């Protein structure tokens, strides 16, 4: 379930086999140094050996740092956890800042336990359940068939109850899990003898299964370390996995879970797949959060943390002194910083074209040139937002292409930051000032 979002146009970092960034691949344009560094961090995550590294992405706004993070996440793909949080999310009311950071850190480490299960699959021939009225004894047998074999099973009480609940019939192809006991109705083999109700609701036939009736299959259970901690914190922690309200889990629970998971890894029962934690706008975090991050990165069960910042020198929250990146020197000492630069005219043009392709907006050459000039003049994101409005204006005109006049109308209707600032300065009396004064009347 997704819609066309800001970073929906990038499917990866777009790198070669030697980590050399392509000029334009997988949705990303330019940022060759940044993309190479992101690929190095990608390989570091995929190796799974280096623990608790911190990496910072710095640069001016609209330089693609969040795009770089989304590219890293897409290259990681599924099965490798990626926890995207903002600096504002830590400050909660039910949990402490340190507890929220601990939970965010543990959300990025995945534990995989693989199990082998026996599955019975086939098309039912005959089902027969005999139960005595006003009596608890039930006796039943079923005949489940496959293309090459057919057999009869005499059923216990629980299997009889499960099949009665599932409403299994003759023309049903079902699967039975001998361990769990769940019955899944895969489909139908033929019609239901033309009774009145439910006349033609079974037309979507499914083919009869083929092969051994009882076959073994493997099932992988992937659960993050934080989920295990929440489950083992209290008896009602399982509800807390969905409701929230996990509380502040006692440190002994986390230590014991760490020891148990290490034992599982040494035993081969579980596979640990560390991931990446991504903090948007880390400058919103307090100095206490930065100290905890400093210490918690030294743990052996820690993920790789990547942060985005554009503040330059700024006051660290919780302190009264300015810091090089809005972060204390202690955190800067243990983090590798990857930088981003402003975009050329050509890079802006090709990013606009990529966005137009993703938004399914067909731009004429002159319209694209005008949009590129506007983006260089005002902002990349401004032109990106203008594309869709221009498409809507063109649709209002009953035209299937965006021309220069549609972009001109969109430019006239919707303003940039600079034009709004100019209009405010020219008409300052019509707006409420910081001193709380405004003129409402026009005379």
């Amino acid at each position: 379930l997704s819609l066309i979002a800001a970073h929906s146009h990038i499917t990866g970092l777009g790198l070669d086999e030697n980590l050399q960034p392509r000029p334009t691949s997988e949705g990303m344009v330019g940022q060759l140094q940044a993309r190479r560094a992101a690929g190095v961090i990608l390989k570091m995550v995929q190796n799974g050996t280096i623990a608790g590294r911190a990496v910072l992405v710095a640069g001016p706004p609209s330089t693609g740092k969040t795009a770089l993070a989304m590219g890293v996440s897409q290259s990681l793909g599924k099965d490798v956890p990626f926890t995207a949080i903002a600096g504002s999310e830590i400050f909660s009311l039910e949990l402490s800042k340190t507890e929220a950071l601990t939970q965010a850190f543990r959300k990025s480490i995945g534990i995989k336990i693989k199990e082998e299960t026996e599955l019975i699959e086939g098309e039912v021939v005959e089902i027969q359940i005999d139960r005595s009225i006003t009596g608890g004894h039930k006796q039943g047998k079923l005949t489940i068939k496959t293309t090459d074999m057919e057999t009869i099973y005499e059923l216990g009480n629980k299997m009889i109850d499960g099949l009665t609940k599932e409403k299994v019939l003759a023309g049903d192809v079902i699967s039975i899990d001998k361990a769990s006991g769940k019955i899944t109705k895969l489909g139908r083999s033929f019609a239901r003898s033309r009774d009145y109700d439910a006349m033609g609701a079974d037309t979507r036939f499914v083919q009869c299964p083929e092969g051994e009736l009882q076959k073994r299959k493997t099932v992988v259970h992937t659960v993050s370390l934080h989920e295990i901690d929440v489950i083992n914190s209290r008896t009602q922690g399982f509800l807390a996995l969905f409701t929230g309200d996990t509380g502040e889990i006692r440190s002994e629970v986390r230590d014991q879970i760490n020891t148990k998971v290490a034992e599982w890894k040494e035993e081969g029962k579980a596979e640990i797949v560390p991931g990446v934690l991504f903090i948007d706008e880390v400058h919103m975090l307090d100095i206490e959060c930065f100290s905890f991050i400093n210490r918690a990165l030294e743990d052996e069960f820690a993920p790789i943390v990547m942060m985005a910042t554009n503040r330059g020198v700024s006051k660290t929250r919780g302190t009264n002194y300015k810091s090089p990146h809005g972060l204390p020197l202690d955190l800067l000492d243990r983090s590798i910083i990857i930088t981003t630069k402003s975009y050329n005219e050509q890079e802006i043009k090709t990013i606009l074209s990529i966005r137009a392709q993703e938004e399914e907006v067909e731009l004429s050459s002159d319209a694209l040139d005008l949009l590129t000039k506007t983006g260089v003049e005002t902002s990349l994101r401004y032109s990106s937002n203008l594309i869709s409005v221009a498409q809507q204006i063109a649709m209002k005109r009953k035209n299937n292409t965006v021309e220069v006049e549609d972009v001109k109308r969109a430019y006239l209707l919707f303003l940039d930051s600079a034009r709004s600032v100019k209009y405010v300065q020219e008409n300052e009396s019509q707006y409420i000032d910081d001193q709380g004064n405004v003129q409402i009347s026009i005379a």
């Binding site: 083999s189 033929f190 033309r194």
Partner: protein
């Protein structure tokens, strides 16, 4: 001309392969004197 069709059947019977009572069968498929008199004196 249909090849295969699935039928359903429901039966009541006793263990020595004997049928049950007809009225009891019809009741089970689907599921004089005074007893309390009160008057104020």
């Amino acid at each position: 001309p249909e090849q295969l069709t699935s039928r359903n059947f429901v039966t009541l019977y006793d263990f020595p392969n004997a049928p049950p009572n007809l009225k009891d069968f019809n009741t089970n498929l689907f599921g004089m004197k005074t007893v309390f008199h009160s008057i104020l004196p």
